[PDB]
Please model this.
Amino acid sequence: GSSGSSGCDSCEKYITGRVLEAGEKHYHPSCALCVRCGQMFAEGEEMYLQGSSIWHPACRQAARTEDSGPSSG
Ligand SMILES: [Zn+2]
Ligand SMILES: [Zn+2]
Model:
């Protein structure tokens, strides 16, 4: 019990408000920013997930396959 820290994964700080959940994690409404552009999202947006990064629906399209992936098995 008792309050302390149990929410965000980037900063590891509880989140009172909404949390950006992508796949199986949770982050703050500011901590998690599209790696491509880095524009905050809403409290329930839909985007493509890869490994552990947040890729926008329009952004990803561009960063689909650009010198990314050393080993392709
Ligand atoms: Zn955070
Ligand atoms: Zn973006």
Observations:
- DSSP finds one helix and two strands in the chain.
- The pocket of zinc ion (ligand 2) is lined by residues 34, 36-37, 39, 56, 59 (CB under 6 Å).
- The first helix runs from residue 59 to 62.
- The chain has one domain: 1-73.
